C-alpha cells in the first residue's frame, strides 16, 4: 500500500538523476505558453533561486560534473511551489474552453 | 560588494604563472608562443 509506495517513489527519485545535479521538481518542467506563464507569475526571490539552480545545473552538465554527496538534494525536502500556480493555470484554461464552448 | 573575492584557480594553472610573487613577463611570451606554435602546426597540417 502506502508504506511501500514511498519506497518505490524514493527509489525512482534516486534513479531519476536530477537529485544529483542539485535540481528539484520545478526545474525540469517542459513548457508551453502555460508553464511559462506559471514561471511569469512567480515571486522574485524564488525566481532568482530557480535561475541560479538552472545555471549551476547547466554548468555541471557542461563539464559533466555530478555534485558530491554533500549537495545531492534529498527526497522530501523540496518544495512543490508551482502546484497552486500550475493548478490555477489548468483551471483557467479549462474555464476558457468549457465556457466558450 | 567589498567581500567579492575570487575563488582560486591554483589547481588549474601552469606552474610558470602559479607563483604568487614572480613577475608575469617571462612566463607570458613563452606561454603565448606555445599556444601559437600549436596553432601554426595545425595550420601546416591543414595546408598540406
Amino acid at each position: 500500500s502506502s508504506k511501500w509506495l514511498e519506497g518505490i517513489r524514493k527509489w525512482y527519485y534516486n534513479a531519476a538523476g536530477f537529485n544529483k545535479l542539485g535540481l528539484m521538481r520545478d526545474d525540469t518542467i517542459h513548457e508551453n505558453d502555460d508553464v511559462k506563464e506559471a514561471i511569469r507569475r512567480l515571486p522574485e526571490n524564488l525566481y532568482n533561486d530557480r535561475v541560479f539552480r538552472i545555471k549551476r545545473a547547466l554548468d555541471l552538465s557542461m563539464r559533466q560534473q555530478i555534485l558530491p554527496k554533500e549537495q545531492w538534494t534529498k527526497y522530501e525536502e523540496d518544495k512543490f511551489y508551482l502546484e497552486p500556480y500550475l493548478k490555477e493555470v489548468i483551471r483557467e484554461r479549462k474555464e476558457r474552453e468549457e465556457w466558450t464552448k | 560588494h567589498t567581500d567579492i573575492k575570487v575563488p582560486d584557480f591554483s589547481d588549474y594553472r601552469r606552474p610558470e604563472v602559479l607563483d604568487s610573487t614572480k613577475s608575469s613577463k617571462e612566463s607570458s611570451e613563452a606561454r603565448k608562443g606555445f599556444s601559437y606554435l600549436i596553432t601554426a602546426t595545425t595550420t601546416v597540417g591543414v595546408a598540406y
Partner: protein
C-alpha cells in the same frame, strides 16, 4: 531571437580566467578516467541489457538455421 532580450537575471557573478594561463589538459589522467568510469556505471544498467538479448537472438538464429538445414534420416 537574437542576443540580449533573453531573460532577467540578478544576483549572479561569473568568474573565469584567461585561456592562456590555465593549462591545456588539467589532470587528464587523474580525473578523466574515474570520471568516465562514473559515466559508464551510470548508464550500462539502462543500455547494456537489451544488447545481450540481441546477441542471444543472433546466436539462436544462426544455430536454429543450421539445425533446420541438417536433416539426418536413417535407412
Amino acid at each position: 531571437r537574437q542576443f540580449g532580450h533573453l531573460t532577467r537575471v540578478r544576483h549572479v557573478i561569473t568568474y573565469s580566467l584567461s585561456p592562456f594561463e590555465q593549462r591545456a589538459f588539467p589532470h587528464y589522467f587523474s580525473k578523466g578516467i574515474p570520471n568516465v568510469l562514473r559515466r559508464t556505471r551510470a548508464c550500462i544498467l539502462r543500455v547494456a541489457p537489451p544488447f545481450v538479448v540481441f546477441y542471444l537472438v543472433y546466436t539462436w538464429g544462426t544455430q536454429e538455421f543450421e539445425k533446420s538445414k541438417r536433416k539426418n534420416p536413417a535407412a
